[PDB]
Amino acid sequence: VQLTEKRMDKVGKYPKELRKCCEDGMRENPMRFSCQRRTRFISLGEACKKVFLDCCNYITELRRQHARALDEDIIAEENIVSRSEFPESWLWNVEDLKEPPKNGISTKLMNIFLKDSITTWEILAVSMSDKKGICVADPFEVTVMQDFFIDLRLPYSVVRNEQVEIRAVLYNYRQNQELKVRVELLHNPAFCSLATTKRRHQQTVTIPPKSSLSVPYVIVPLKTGLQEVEVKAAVYHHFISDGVRKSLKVVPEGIRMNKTVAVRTLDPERLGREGVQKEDIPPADLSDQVPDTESETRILLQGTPVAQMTEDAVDAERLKHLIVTPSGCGEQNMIGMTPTVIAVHYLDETEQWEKFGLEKRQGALELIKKGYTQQLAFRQPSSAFAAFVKRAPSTWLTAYVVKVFSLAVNLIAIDSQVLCGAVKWLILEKQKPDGVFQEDAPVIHQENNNEKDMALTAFVLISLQEAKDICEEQVNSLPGSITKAGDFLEANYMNLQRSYTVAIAGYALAQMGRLKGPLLNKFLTTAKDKNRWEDPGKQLYNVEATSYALLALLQLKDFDFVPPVVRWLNEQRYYGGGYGSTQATFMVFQALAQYQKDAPDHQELNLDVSLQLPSRSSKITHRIHWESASLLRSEETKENEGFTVTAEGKGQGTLSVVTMYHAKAKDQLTCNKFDLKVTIKPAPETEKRPQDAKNTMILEICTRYRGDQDATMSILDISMMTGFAPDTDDLKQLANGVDRYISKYELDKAFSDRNTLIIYLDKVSHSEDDCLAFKVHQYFNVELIQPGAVKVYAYYNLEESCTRFYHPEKEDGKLNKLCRDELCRCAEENCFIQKSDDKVTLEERLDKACEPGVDYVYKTRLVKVQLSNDFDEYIMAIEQTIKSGSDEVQVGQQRTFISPIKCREALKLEEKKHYLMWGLSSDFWGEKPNLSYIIGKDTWVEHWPEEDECQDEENQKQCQDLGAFTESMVVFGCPN
Amino acid sequence: SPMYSIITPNILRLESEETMVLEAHDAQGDVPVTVTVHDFPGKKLVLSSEKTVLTPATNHMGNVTFTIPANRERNKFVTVQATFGTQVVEKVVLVSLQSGYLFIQTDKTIYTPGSTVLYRIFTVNHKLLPVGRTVMVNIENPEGIPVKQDSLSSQNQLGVLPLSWDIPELVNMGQWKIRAYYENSPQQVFSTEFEVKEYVLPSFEVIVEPTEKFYYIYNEKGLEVTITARFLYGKKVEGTAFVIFGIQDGEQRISLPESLKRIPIEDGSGEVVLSRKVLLDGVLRAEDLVGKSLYVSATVILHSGSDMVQAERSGIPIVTSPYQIHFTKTPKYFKPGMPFDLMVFVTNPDGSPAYRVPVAVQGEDTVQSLTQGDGVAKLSINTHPSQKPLSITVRTKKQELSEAEQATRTMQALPYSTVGNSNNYLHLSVLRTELRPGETLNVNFLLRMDRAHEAKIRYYTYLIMNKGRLLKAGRQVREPGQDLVVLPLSITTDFIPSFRLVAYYTLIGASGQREVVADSVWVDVKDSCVGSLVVKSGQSEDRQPVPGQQMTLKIEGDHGARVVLVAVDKGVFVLNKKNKLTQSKIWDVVEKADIGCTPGSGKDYAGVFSDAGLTFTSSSGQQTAQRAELQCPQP
Ligand SMILES: *[C@@H]1O[C@H](CO)[C@@H](O[C@@H]2O[C@H](CO)[C@@H](O[C@@H]3O[C@H](CO[C@@H]4O[C@H](CO)[C@@H](O)[C@H](O)[C@@H]4O)[C@@H](O)[C@H](O[C@@H]4O[C@H](CO)[C@@H](O)[C@H](O)[C@@H]4O)[C@@H]3O)[C@H](O)[C@H]2NC(C)=O)[C@H](O)[C@H]1NC(C)=O
Numbered sequence A: 001v002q003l004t005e006k007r008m009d010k011v012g013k014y015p016k017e018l019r020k021c022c023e024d025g026m027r028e029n030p031m032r033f034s035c036q037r038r039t040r041f042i043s044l045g046e047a048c049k050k051v052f053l054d055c056c057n058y059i060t061e062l063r064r065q066h067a068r069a070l071d072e073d074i075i076a077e078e079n080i081v082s083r084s085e086f087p088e089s090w091l092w093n094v095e096d097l098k099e100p101p102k103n104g105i106s107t108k109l110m111n112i113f114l115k116d117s118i119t120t121w122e123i124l125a126v127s128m129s130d131k132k133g134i135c136v137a138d139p140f141e142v143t144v145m146q147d148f149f150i151d152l153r154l155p156y157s158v159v160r161n162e163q164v165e166i167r168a169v170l171y172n173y174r175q176n177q178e179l180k181v182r183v184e185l186l187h188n189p190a191f192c193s194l195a196t197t198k199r200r201h202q203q204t205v206t207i208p209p210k211s212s213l214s215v216p217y218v219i220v221p222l223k224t225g226l227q228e229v230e231v232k233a234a235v236y237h238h239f240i241s242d243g244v245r246k247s248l249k250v251v252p253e254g255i256r257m258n259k260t261v262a263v264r265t266l267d268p269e270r271l272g273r274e275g276v277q278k279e280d281i282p283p284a285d286l287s288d289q290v291p292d293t294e295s296e297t298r299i300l301l302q303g304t305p306v307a308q309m310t311e312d313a314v315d316a317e318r319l320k321h322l323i324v325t326p327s328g329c330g331e332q333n334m335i336g337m338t339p340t341v342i343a344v345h346y347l348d349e350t351e352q353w354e355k356f357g358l359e360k361r362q363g364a365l366e367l368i369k370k371g372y373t374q375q376l377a378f379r380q381p382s383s384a385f386a387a388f389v390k391r392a393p394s395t396w397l398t399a400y401v402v403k404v405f406s407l408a409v410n411l412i413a414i415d416s417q418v419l420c421g422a423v424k425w426l427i428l429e430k431q432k433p434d435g436v437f438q439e440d441a442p443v444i445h446q447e448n449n450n451e452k453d454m455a456l457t458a459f460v461l462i463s464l465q466e467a468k469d470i471c472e473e474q475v476n477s478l479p480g481s482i483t484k485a486g487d488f489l490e491a492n493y494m495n496l497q498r499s500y501t502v503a504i505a506g507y508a509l510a511q512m513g514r515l516k517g518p519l520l521n522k523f524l525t526t527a528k529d530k531n532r533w534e535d536p537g538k539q540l541y542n543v544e545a546t547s548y549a550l551l552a553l554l555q556l557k558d559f560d561f562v563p564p565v566v567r568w569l570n571e572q573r574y575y576g577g578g579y580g581s582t583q584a585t586f587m588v589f590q591a592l593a594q595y596q597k598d599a600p601d602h603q604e605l606n607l608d609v610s611l612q613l614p615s616r617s618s619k620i621t622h623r624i625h626w627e628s629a630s631l632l633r634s635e636e637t638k639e640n641e642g643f644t645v646t647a648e649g650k651g652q653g654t655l656s657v658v659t660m661y662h663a664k665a666k667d668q669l670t671c672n673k674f675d676l677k678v679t680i681k682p683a684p685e686t687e688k689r690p691q692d693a694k695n696t697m698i699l700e701i702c703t704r705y706r707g708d709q710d711a712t713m714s715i716l717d718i719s720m721m722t723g724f725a726p727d728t729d730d731l732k733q734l735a736n737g738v739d740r741y742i743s744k745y746e747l748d749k750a751f752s753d754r755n756t757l758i759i760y761l762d763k764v765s766h767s768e769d770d771c772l773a774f775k776v777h778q779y780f781n782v783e784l785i786q787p788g789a790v791k792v793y794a795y796y797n798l799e800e801s802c803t804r805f806y807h808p809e810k811e812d813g814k815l816n817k818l819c820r821d822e823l824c825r826c827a828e829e830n831c832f833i834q835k836s837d838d839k840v841t842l843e844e845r846l847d848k849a850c851e852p853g854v855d856y857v858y859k860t861r862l863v864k865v866q867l868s869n870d871f872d873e874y875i876m877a878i879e880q881t882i883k884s885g886s887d888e889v890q891v892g893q894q895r896t897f898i899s900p901i902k903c904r905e906a907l908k909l910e911e912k913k914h915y916l917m918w919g920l921s922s923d924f925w926g927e928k929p930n931l932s933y934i935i936g937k938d939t940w941v942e943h944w945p946e947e948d949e950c951q952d953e954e955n956q957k958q959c960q961d962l963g964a965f966t967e968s969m970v971v972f973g974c975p976n
Numbered sequence B: 001s002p003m004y005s006i007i008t009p010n011i012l013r014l015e016s017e018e019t020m021v022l023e024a025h026d027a028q029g030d031v032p033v034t035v036t037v038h039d040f041p042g043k044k045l046v047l048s049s050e051k052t053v054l055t056p057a058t059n060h061m062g063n064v065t066f067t068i069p070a071n072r073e074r075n076k077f078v079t080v081q082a083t084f085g086t087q088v089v090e091k092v093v094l095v096s097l098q099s100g101y102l103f104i105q106t107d108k109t110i111y112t113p114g115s116t117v118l119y120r121i122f123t124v125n126h127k128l129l130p131v132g133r134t135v136m137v138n139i140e141n142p143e144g145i146p147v148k149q150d151s152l153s154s155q156n157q158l159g160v161l162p163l164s165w166d167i168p169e170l171v172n173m174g175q176w177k178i179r180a181y182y183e184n185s186p187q188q189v190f191s192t193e194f195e196v197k198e199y200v201l202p203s204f205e206v207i208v209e210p211t212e213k214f215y216y217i218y219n220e221k222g223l224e225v226t227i228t229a230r231f232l233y234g235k236k237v238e239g240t241a242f243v244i245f246g247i248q249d250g251e252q253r254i255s256l257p258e259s260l261k262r263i264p265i266e267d268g269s270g271e272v273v274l275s276r277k278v279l280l281d282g283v284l285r286a287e288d289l290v291g292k293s294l295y296v297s298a299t300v301i302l303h304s305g306s307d308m309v310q311a312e313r314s315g316i317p318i319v320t321s322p323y324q325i326h327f328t329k330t331p332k333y334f335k336p337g338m339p340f341d342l343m344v345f346v347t348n349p350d351g352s353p354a355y356r357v358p359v360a361v362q363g364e365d366t367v368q369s370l371t372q373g374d375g376v377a378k379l380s381i382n383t384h385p386s387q388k389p390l391s392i393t394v395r396t397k398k399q400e401l402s403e404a405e406q407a408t409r410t411m412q413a414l415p416y417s418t419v420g421n422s423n424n425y426l427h428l429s430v431l432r433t434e435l436r437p438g439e440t441l442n443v444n445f446l447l448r449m450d451r452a453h454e455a456k457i458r459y460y461t462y463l464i465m466n467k468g469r470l471l472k473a474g475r476q477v478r479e480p481g482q483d484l485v486v487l488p489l490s491i492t493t494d495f496i497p498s499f500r501l502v503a504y505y506t507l508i509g510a511s512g513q514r515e516v517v518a519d520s521v522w523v524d525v526k527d528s529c530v531g532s533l534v535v536k537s538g539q540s541e542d543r544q545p546v547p548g549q550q551m552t553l554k555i556e557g558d559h560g561a562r563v564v565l566v567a568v569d570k571g572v573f574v575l576n577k578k579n580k581l582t583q584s585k586i587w588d589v590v591e592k593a594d595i596g597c598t599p600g601s602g603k604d605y606a607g608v609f610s611d612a613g614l615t616f617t618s619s620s621g622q623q624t625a626q627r628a629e630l631q632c633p634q635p
């Protein structure tokens, strides 16, 4: 009968060091997870387990009785001093008093514009006279106040042809007076609203004193892009004439996709042939494209395998363009530093700041500062660095951090205390007397138990060589520690099986010059085609391994093996024109840039690339030259053409071709390495959601790795539906619970295309599904919503992933909101030639079928209907071609007619009934041999009654009409 | 037989204006005086000449002020020279390596990752005038690690050093500090702290605050609390609130589980009570709680949504009396026979002074007094000429408070000395007022000695000690047989925030040896600005500001002065509440640097001078002890 109070009374007992475990156990669980089940996720001592078990045992039995017979059930908790978001400080300027003094009094008027915030400002003044010293003035208070205020509340984004109900919140601040207001939604042809060109939509509403009021509007957006929604308000009697004009973004009906099409090194001479290089590039697939969406092909020319990267690593707002993945974890956050560090180094050693722009450098140094500042969030006592703040410290991660830090000591100020404590930690605590290094955290990267020892020590030994002559006096046993690790290497190296290790440990040994003879052969013979060190399945790791192998080759000054390797590394960009993950990117970056710095070849740029798109009449002639601030050039086309590229004379660079389009929903057909089951179910209606949430739902994700060993660093990439937002309480509980099912949640809308939630995981079990569930709230009611997507993937091998979509549930006839009037008939107009009036005479048919646009006129017989959630597919067999178009079709063949989901109810096409269809050549979709059709605003659909039922009353009138049409179109066709 | 006196501050600050006050007792004509300082021990010489002539027509007054250069650098000492013709007096004084003051301003005390910290560094000397020095400013995270380092000079900026820092959106949580030190003095560092917490923006606001600022233990009414909750736009909230009380033991918290109550919130308003019954069942015995503090925790769950805000009011002081009484202002030494003036300090349980508190002395009350706004009232008791130590007790007697509710406090006052046993004293008495610069203040010189050598005393020497330095010097004439002389002292803006007053007289003794009786007194002046600065609305009042509007701001400051401004949300300004950069808080830093310790008087004749920050040395054999220490006895 209390439950909230029976709680906290149980937390009342138990010592101080224990109330954490009981508190978190008393809580429920987003998953149905049991009490014993919840345990063993719990990470502390067994004293912590005993309390956790005892407490949820206590509570789950107590509320199990509440079901038998509207009362709260939460924790009062301890010490939350909330509210941090305050309006930004302003008026940060300095004025001296130069007015003639009137017995000290030197009045100086100063004019300013108050911010547009309803608040109370506190102006603080501090004087400083070289005659009478400092004088801190009393605070001056300014209460900026407004009576009436409008807030327009739109979803993050709306999908084309969805049915959102936005709301205009109106505030009445007056303390003892209710405001009457005339509010109006303005017409915008971009979306169907209750306001049309015909008549406006204004209505009177009365808002109580010291309160607010919500005014809903239904809008059905017809066009994609950023649309302007404006409500206008005129309050009665007062001449307060206010209005709000926000912009909601209408996204298309699928999911955004940057598909990499080609790469190819551009190097005339080198195998590019004396027949200077000619390059064939195939059209992008785009078979799963969304009907009536744009695509765009971006062709990029790179004067140097490192150029896009150098350009990006330097700029603060393009730095994130190097990585398709989130960056909120121990090693991921290192984008803040690593790229920029190597990129600055690169431009220093090759002397390019002159032509490139010296201004950019001081800008670049500030990034490494910022990145360093960020990285310190992961630093623990002492100097240990963990993958997530306040969690088990990683040997691998520290090693990494030590490298970049050590390689940055020159560029920005690195605290030697921070740096050398870490080197002091790795050596004194993590290195076994054997020379091996230990890992005591859960592994972030690539998993007898050699090679485990051999790889990690290789990685740590590469780190220590950067701190060598910096932590000399600070760390005593550095030089001996490296020796111990170096000796362990050149003994066990000849037993290495995995191609990855042979490279990384090969490089580590090369740094010492201890890669020689039989070991060198081992390193060299491990490369396939003499251009890459690669392993089955481990794709992005091969880019990592190969990069190391290049660094080893450069370390050995063996510049014959190198060319083909640099060619291969150049072309391993499958996620945009880029390598995907952090470790992958920064590794190839470093090594490719190291090739530039260590080359005995003056490989100079005088490239003459010419482009012939079959869509453009004029050729494109780009001339990339060394000694010009760029080394870059790009081109865009809206058409998905196959084109041909020609390079000429001198230079080693790249040619990345990438198209962006919107692929349809539909769950991935072959999840080859990851299992994923996604579920969404309505929560009980008495669940108590936040005050704005219209409706709450439970979203369960269930995932499993298809490997022989657990997957390490992995991500759930959850893009919410529209209006929906995840319960941040439940996610917190999942990450901050003494159980802990998650490493952290991101909730980052990078930008556009629906707001996303990113979940970091330490591992994914290959033994069984790793389920976690959580509440989502729906802050606007919407009809006809498209599925939200979920994607799992290994952070360091993106090649392994799985993409599933989630969607509430039909249950027999999808519902709109609402119809009853023109608002509903407005939306349906968009798709299929709106008859209305229901005249449709024989004479009226002949006029419309004779439009110069009308390409085809079929009599179809609907075979199968495969209605999905996003688009309907009607498979129509052709019964007679009354007029054929550029698409030839045989009588007895089939064509798939696609229609939007918002037009299923209007078309009402019953299976195995006959139809008369026609439309423009604009309706064609997807080239032969199998073509599809798009039922659009120019597609006349009509029911063709069967022969056995032409006898009836409602049909014989319509029947011979079609017969008159059929002949007067075959025998005579169009009159003009 | 003449006498020659050298008077100098206790610790001598380098590279600063220091006054060496010189005199001449009983001398026919005038004598040349040159003062010079050496390193101890060594032939260094930091100052050569600086001459003064002790003119008989001016009672023999001598200033000779000089700044000691800073060079080769266990606490250093300097030997000072005072040559009066042939006979020369020396003193070994302690040196101080202290630049001045740095003040750090921050627009807010809590920030979200992503936002900007706007901070200024004010560089000022010992007179609190602006000065162009080199300064180093760091920004540390909670783990001590510096993430921003700057070397900047403060010249031509006439004092101010504007700086900025953008917090990255992924960064340490906790109390970030801003350390700042003069490059001249890496020894002395100044800090300000701020929090980063993280983006949290609650639906509504909850304020939990008791009807009383304190809890009287024996009061059976209990501690009543008013829960107030309302939306951020002034809608009264309807919901439910769970409160729970607990006792804070310094920094250790004991939750009282049985104080947990569930109350309904009606029209943004709620009510709850912690009873004494349940309070004493959370431990026993009532007196053990005096000095402890109570806290409340309020959780307000809405009736509409699941939304929930928490609020905590802690530091509710448990008291045996609504008032405190302090003797931190009162001297610790009395003169047997003479009246003894008490500077009773009366504060509320929180720290702030209490206006109008009728107080009297135990043993002999009546007469009574009335507290001023600064929480001080004066009380005098004439006691017998006894060598026995005086123990005084001062109670309060406020009307409409019960006799068991009042406050009591005891102090111990030791006797003078008059070495050796001659019973001749000097008493300084001052009126306790809200005295403001520009006014005049009467200072009373009371004499108590045997009726034989009371005609020889012709003048009193009085010395002003302000902000650790020597300020003003002069004389006070006396007609033989006079038991009291008054000094008209004109207080200026040179006495803020507080000034000491030392007075002494010297003569041929009662037995045969020299007698030099002395006394000191401490006087607080209105602790405000030297100049002034006022901000008000420049427009003719009219009507209230509206969002996005042009409005005029009037700045009333000092000519030529530089004014730095910032405009912050009242919500973060009232959220401080301890790092507030007040004018009072600026003088507090100057007081805690002041020398020396005792709020007046001394153990003996020369224990007065040291306890006020001075070193008296005679040409005979009468001097003060050597101060080798920079600070004071532990509080
Ligand atoms: C997937 O592939 C797509 C390409 O299909 C990419 O996504 C977006 O592609 C856009 C082109 O379609 C890119 O637009 C470029 O961004 C420019 C930004 O302007 C810069 O601003 C910074 C300030 O920080 C300055 O330093 C620079 O000097 C630049 O000025 C745009 O200028 C440019 O087009 C502009 O659009 C603005 C709109 O406000 C116009 O005002 C202006 O006239 C001009 O037309 C263009 O948009 C864009 O980089 C990119 N967006 C993203 C995701 O950042 C990505 O490459 C791929 N997506 C991923 C991450 O996989």
Ligand SMILES: *[C@@H]1O[C@H](CO)[C@@H](O[C@@H]2O[C@H](CO)[C@@H](O)[C@H](O)[C@H]2NC(C)=O)[C@H](O)[C@H]1NC(C)=O
Pocket: B019, B063, B470, B471, B472, B473
């Ligand atoms: C020591 O000398 C100073 C400086 O000469 C005197 O203080 C003031 O000096 C100014 C010089 O412009 C006179 O106008 C004032 O009348 C002086 N004020 C007084 C009377 O104190 C003063 O003679 C001495 N002050 C000290 C530090 O004792």
